[PDB]
Amino acid sequence: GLEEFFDDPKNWGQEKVKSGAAWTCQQLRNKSNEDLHKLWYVLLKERNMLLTLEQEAKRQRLPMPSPERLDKVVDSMDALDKVVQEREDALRLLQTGQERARPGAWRRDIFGRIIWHKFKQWVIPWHLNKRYNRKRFFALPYVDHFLRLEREKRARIKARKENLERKKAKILLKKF
Amino acid sequence: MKYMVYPQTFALNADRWYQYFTKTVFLSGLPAALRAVACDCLLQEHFYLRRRRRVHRYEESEVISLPFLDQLVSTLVGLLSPHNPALAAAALDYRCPVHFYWVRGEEIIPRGHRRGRIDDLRYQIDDKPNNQIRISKQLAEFVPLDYSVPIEIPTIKCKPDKLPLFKRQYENHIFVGSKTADPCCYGHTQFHLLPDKLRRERLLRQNCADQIEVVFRANAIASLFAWTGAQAMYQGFWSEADVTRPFVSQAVITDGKYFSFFCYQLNTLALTTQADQNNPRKNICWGTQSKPLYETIEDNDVKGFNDDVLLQIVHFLLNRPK
């Protein structure tokens, strides 16, 4: 029912609503996959209720009662997602040895920068895909000068940072 | 800029909103060879007639029911002409447009350089009834003009936009299906076919089981009000010259299997605020719950044909001017 989008009617208007601690990753790791699946929707309903409270508080130009529980719920959901992702990653590594769920490859783009191109799902092979063939994954010789220039810009920035750090350290040592 | 009112509408509870826009009160109810011919039309459009191209569900309505309703109207008119002399001279129109433009209520412009200025709420109905019958002699009033009914017209507490309803600025048309020069200016019956988007199955899937009757009722109210208002304004009446006699019309709205019957009496064209401030008149729409003409069609046989529905159609066609 729509009443699940709002806090308890008794809690309505309360300046402060007491809440427990956010779920921890270690605590969640002990729960079964079905238990985590159910807790995900429990936390999702709580998160929807708290976001509703936040938006209504903004509308009414009033502080949200106990704003910290929204952060607690977000942290709990993040921990649950991390636990599920850890389990999926472990299973994937065991069964296939792949450390990434999505296929990809290190490729040199048209600008000469090495990127991790993440493969997309297609129904036809790449040699037939027209748009993919239009996309270019190689850098022509004229890009080498710009690659060198970018490298030198990065080197200058790094040198400035390091020299400034050394200057500040020397000033600190002299002061103390 | 004016709200475009769609008779066949996906909007929920659109019947009440149309009742408000029209000042209409809805009332439940009404104020052998033919069976063979109806079954013949059904079987012609379902089984007998060979289709070169495969028929898909999304086009089943257009390629089955629409020819079926056309055949029903034509054959029934031909067969009932002996029993209804006026029906002989009547003009039968297929998908001829029916346009009605009117003004109902006022609104303060919310925003813009015209904010705070009073502006009339204009509505335009552009219907395309699958079939319709037009005559030269007006039908008799179903109930005397100034018929006071205790039921109160629904009121809308929000803007018409909130019901899915959008404004446009195009030609304002008042059209009965033929130009004013056509002698056959009064209406007799409108046969409407609901579109595929408004299928009973689709509504059931969308959890709109309560809205089948709403769809039929809204289509009836809108289409019949537009037709009667167009007839009245062809006769010369308008908001400041409200009709001196009721303008009657009938409609049958079908989804292909389920039929519903509606009778509409226009008693008021004074829908604007100025002309409605002290107007006791209110239009009336009698309607019946949708009933299935047949249960199912298996190959060469139609199961559970509804003689009551067929006789309802026959009675509407047999209604005559006085």
């Binding site: 040699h127 | 070169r52 031909g78 020069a181």
Partner: protein, 392 residues
């Protein structure tokens, strides 16, 4: 001279790398890279085909492998076939003898004043005015709108005679009805797949017009040939077809007997609109096709002289001009060029009205021609009503 210029023709693939030509070594291509690079050899990708069947991305098998492909070419006449020689070509194809003017049997059905509709002139004028001026909100309705409307309104006006003729309750006006009929002429396999216009369908067959003596007399008549134009011109040559005689309805259908094929040329554009001769030829061919389908259904697929000739009427129109046809099929032995021949009575270019003025023409602020039809000819509607009443 070859049509299609090189710049528009598909570009030739670039020449293969010499690494492929060299026998003993395996070329290094960018296939492993999964993308093109200009400094590696171009892969030779094996042909690809999606494993599963996918509509919306489906390629048909090459034509010769279609199950219905046949070396013998069937020439099909459909709703959008415009014969070059027109009436002569249709008569040769259908093995028909032409008679100018409708038969006396049908023409006399309107001579008696009782069959005459009350206020024929006024009612037909009203029908024309509604079709051409009052039909829609548009100031000048187009042919695509006023041709079907005028035909339907005339049919309704005729149907109003149910009071006088109760036999008119045994007929219906079916739409979207399509028929198919095949036959041989001089070893040429000709099919007619007629669709489009409306079909009046009766519960009883139409009475024969011509007598057996006239049918025999048709033997002496010789089909007018035309050279070098072949009778096949303008007919769709088709090598992938199915020889079948279909009446368009399942067996047991009420109102089985065709009575009038109402054909309408509702194209707005003159080039897209049939010429009068081509429309008459189309009427001939569709009437012959319906009659032949009826004959094949009734007396079987036997090439023989029909003991009970099949009569089919047809009314072609363009909204203003009409053409009336009564076709008597009295023989299914079409292959032979000699013998008894079908016969068609034709009345051509019967114009219901000379012109219609949607707007009042004004010269020097003076109305020269008022709004409405000009040159109305009630004789055309009398012929229309005669055809409608025939058989009742």
């Amino acid at each position: 001279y070859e049509w299609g210029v090189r710049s528009t023709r598909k570009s030739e693939p670039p020449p293969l790398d010499r690494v492929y030509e060299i026998p003993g070594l395996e070329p290094i291509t960018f296939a492993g890279k999964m993308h093109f690079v200009p400094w590696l050899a171009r892969p030779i990708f094996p042909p690809w085909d999606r494993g599963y069947k996918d509509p919306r991305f489906y390629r048909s098998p090459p034509l010769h492998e279609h199950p219905l492909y046949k070396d013998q070419a069937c020439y099909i006449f459909h709703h959008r076939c415009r014969l070059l020689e027109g009436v002569k070509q249709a008569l040769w194809l259908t093995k028909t003898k032409l008679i100018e003017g409708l038969p006396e049997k049908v023409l006399s059905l309107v001579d008696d004043p009782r069959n005459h509709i009350e206020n024929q002139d006024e009612c037909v004028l009203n029908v024309i005015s509604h079709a051409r001026l009052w039909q829609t909100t548009e100031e000048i309705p187009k042919r695509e709108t006023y041709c079907p409307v005028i035909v339907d309104n005339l049919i309704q006006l005729c149907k109003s005679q149910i009071l006088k003729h109760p036999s008119l309750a045994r007929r219906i006006c079916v739409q979207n009805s399509t028929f198919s009929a095949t036959w041989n002429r001089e070893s040429l396999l000709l099919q007619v797949r007629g669709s489009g216009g409306a079909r009046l369908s009766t519960k009883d067959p139409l009475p024969t017009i011509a007598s057996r003596e006239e049918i025999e007399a048709t033997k002496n008549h010789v089909l007018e040939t035309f050279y070098p134009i072949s009778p096949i011109i303008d007919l769709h040559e088709c090598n992938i077809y199915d020889v079948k005689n279909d009446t368009g309805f399942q067996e047991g259908y009420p109102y089985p007997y065709p009575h009038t094929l109402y054909l309408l040329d509702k194209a707005n554009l003159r080039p897209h609109r049939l010429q009068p001769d081509q429309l008459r030829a189309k009427m001939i061919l569709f009437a012959f096709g319906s009659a032949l389908a009826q004959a094949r259904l009734l007396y079987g697929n036997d090439a023989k002289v029909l003991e009970q000739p099949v009569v089919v009427q047809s009314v072609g129109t363009d909204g203003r001009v009409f053409h009336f046809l009564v076709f008597q099929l009295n023989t299914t032995d079409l292959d032979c060029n000699e013998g008894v021949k079908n016969l068609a009575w034709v009345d051509s270019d019967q114009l219901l009205y000379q012109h219609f003025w949607c707007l009042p023409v004004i010269k020097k602020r003076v109305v020269v021609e008022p709004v409405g039809p000009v040159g109305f000819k009630p004789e055309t509607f009398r012929k229309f009503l005669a055809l409608y009443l025939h058989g009742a």
